[PDB]
Amino acid sequence: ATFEIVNRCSYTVWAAASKGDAALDAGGRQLNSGESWTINVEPGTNGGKIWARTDCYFDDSGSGICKTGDCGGLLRCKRFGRPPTTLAEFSLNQYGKDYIDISNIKGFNVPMNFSPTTRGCRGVRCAADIVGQCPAKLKAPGGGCNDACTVFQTSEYCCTTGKCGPTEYSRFFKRLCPDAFSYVLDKPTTVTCPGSSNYRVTFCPTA
Q: What single string gives the DSSP state of each residue in 91-140?
A: EEEETTEEEEEEE-TT-BSS-EEEEESSSS---EEE-S-HHHH--GGGB-
Contacts of residue 136, defined as CB under 8 A and 6 or more positions apart, other chains included, come to none
CB 41 within 8 A of CB 24: yes
Contacts of residue 138, defined as CB under 8 A and 6 or more positions apart, other chains included, come to 107, 145, 146, 147, 148, 151, 169, 172
**b/e per residue 45-71 (b: at least 16 CB within 10 A):** beebbbbbbbbbebeeeeeeebbbbbb
CATH architecture assigned to 1-207 = Sandwich (2.60)
3-class DSSP state of 57: strand
Give the determination technique: X-ray
DSSP E strands: which ranges in 8-104? Answer: 13-18, 23-31, 36-40, 48-58, 64-68, 87-94, 97-103
- Among candidates 66, 64, 65, which has minimal Cα distance to 53? 66
The structural domains of the chain, with segments of one domain joined by +, span 1-207
Give the resolution value in Å. 1.1
Distance CA 185, CA 27 (A): 29
Query: Within 10 A of 77 (CB to CB), how many other CB atoms are there?
Result: 28
Which residues are paired to 145 by β-bridges?
A: 108, 139
User: Which run of H or of E encompasses 4?
Assistant: strand 2-7
CA of 162: how far to CAs of 157, 185, 186, in Å? 11, 8, 12
Q: For 25, left (φ over 0), alpha (ψ -120 to 50), or beta?
A: left
Distance CA 1, CA 195 (A): 10
Query: Within 10 A of 165 (CB to CB), how many other CB atoms are there?
Result: 9
- Terminal CA-to-CA distance of the chain, rounded, Å? 27
Ramachandran angles phi, psi of 177, nearest 5° = -135, 85
